[PDB]
Amino acid sequence: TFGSGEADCGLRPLFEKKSLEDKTERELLESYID
Amino acid sequence: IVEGSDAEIGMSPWQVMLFRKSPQELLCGASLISDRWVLTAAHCLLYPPWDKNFTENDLLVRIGKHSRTRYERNIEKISMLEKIYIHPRYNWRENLDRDIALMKLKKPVAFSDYIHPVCLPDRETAASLLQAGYKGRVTGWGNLKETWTANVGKGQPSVLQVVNLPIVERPVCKDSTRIRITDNMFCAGYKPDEGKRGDACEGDSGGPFVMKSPFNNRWYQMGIVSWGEGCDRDGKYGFYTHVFRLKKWIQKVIDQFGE
DNA sequence: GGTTGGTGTGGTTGG
Ligand SMILES: *C[C@@](*)(O)[C@H](CCCNC(N)=[NH2+])NC(=O)[C@@H]1CCCN1C(=O)[C@H](N)Cc1ccccc1
Ligand SMILES: *[C@@H]1O[C@H](CO)[C@@H](O)[C@H](O)[C@H]1NC(C)=O
Ligand SMILES: [K+]
Ligand code: NA
């Protein structure tokens, strides 16, 4: 069985959950345009 | 990780350290996908050519770590393995095709600010983001340089390292190496004419290659650090196990039992 | 001393 955690996966307690971006995360977003 | 930087605390809460009981040794990276499942590279557990064949009782998993070596008391969780499942078609002899393994924890781990699982990709997320030029993130406590020959600098970091790397077009991946590439792999890294560097290295195997979805802003694991030739060499690219392409085997074992 | 280092006795955390 999968176990607990799927519905909340990929949301970090110290970043997304606090609405805080980490230091280079925008660099990823920017590479995804076009 | 070569040419990356210290990771911020809580930055990769799905980062797992695969640890050898005796002698005590950091063996590889790995990732948390649930409260009881850990993903890693098969070669970290089984590699006949170097006489490597670990069993569940030889290993420990250290979840929630930042420092490579001090015991982060009341932060990290150390878990025993109930079972190790290596892909049944892992080609160790030829080219590490399907270099993936699942490890089931003895007891489920509680989540915290430092321990949270990453998402496995679905078809739309893979179709959308696994494109040349799109950047992913790789993390690890692995080597900072090629340590098998003389080189300046520390060979290992004191804290978890991160580095962002662009996925590379399959033809370039294919022409950059004489090892036979497979659809179960993908490569990433900057080209010589891009003037930015970075790569995973020895000791980073099993760590995750993650991407942040701009559709629901969740992090997804697209790849597993698998192999390379040297570390951060021009014209060379790090290779990663294609998680989505082996997704069917993953669901198959993870959803097998109801216990 | 402690399933581990030191600006320690909190901290990304008890005693
Ligand atoms: C096990 C891992 O830590 C490690 C990851 C290396 C990633 N390197 C780069 N630059 N991103 N993998 C290995 O060390 C694997 C195991 C076998 C040797 N190997 C390689 O990556 C050799 N360097 C190349 C290779 C040999 C045989 C078959 C496939 C690849
Ligand atoms: C790994 O070791 C186990 C026993 O420890 C053995 O049964 C298995 O066949 C080995 N795998 C190899 C060397 O292919
Ligand atoms: K202490
Ligand atoms: Na390179």
Q: Taking Cα atoms only, what radius of gyration of chain B do you get, to the nearest Å?
A: 17 Å
Q: Spell out the CATH superfamily of the largest domain in chain B.
A: Trypsin-like serine proteases
Overall shape of chain B: globular
Number of helices of chain B: 3
SS-based class of chain A: mainly alpha
Label the CATH architecture of chain A: Irregular
How many beta-strand elements of chain A? 0
Which ions and ligands are bound to the chains? the ligand *C[C@@](*)(O)[C@H](CCCNC(N)=[NH2+])NC(=O)[C@@H]1CCCN1C(=O)[C@H](N)Cc1ccccc1, 2-acetamido-2-deoxy-beta-D-glucopyranose, potassium ion, sodium ion
SSE class of chain B = mainly beta
- Main sheet overview of chain A: none
Largest sheet of chain B: 7 strands, antiparallel
The number of E-state strands of chain B comes to 16
The helical percent of chain B reads: under 10%
Percent strand of chain B equals 25-35%
Mass-distribution shape of chain A = flat
| Amount of beta strand of chain A | under 5%
N-to-C span of chain A: 39 Å
The helix-strand sequence of chain B is EEEEEEEEEEHEEHEEEEH
Radius of gyration of chain A: 13 Å
Tell me about this structure.
The complex is a heterodimer of chains A (34) and B (259). With 34 residues, chain A is an all-alpha fold. Helices cover 21% and strands 0% of the residues of chain A. Chain A has a single domain, classed as Thrombin light chain domain (Epsilon-Thrombin, Chain L, Irregular), CATH 4.10.140.10. Chain A has one helix and no strands. Chain A is flat, with a radius of gyration of 13 Å. Chain A starts with 24 loop residues before the first helix and ends with a helix. Chain B has 259 residues and is mostly beta strands. Chain B folds into two domains: 1-12 and 118-244, Beta Barrel (Thrombin, subunit H); 13-117 and 245-258, Thrombin, subunit H (Beta Barrel), CATH 2.40.10.10. In chain B, 8% of the residues lie in helices and 30% in strands. Chain B is built from three helices and 16 strands. Chain B has helices spanning 123-129, 170-175, 247-254; strands at 5-6, 15-20, 25-32, 37-40, 46-47, 52-53, 59-63, 77-79, 81-86, 101-105, 135-140, 161-166, 185-188, 208-212, 219-227, 238-242. The A-B interface holds A 1-6, 8-16, 22-25, 27-29, 31-32 and B 8-11, 13, 33-37, 108, 111-114, 116-120, 129, 133-137, 162, 164, 166, 211-214, 217-220, 254-255, 257-259. Residues 28, 41, 43-44, 95-96, 179, 199-205, 225, 227-229, 231, 238 of chain B line the site of ligand 0G6.
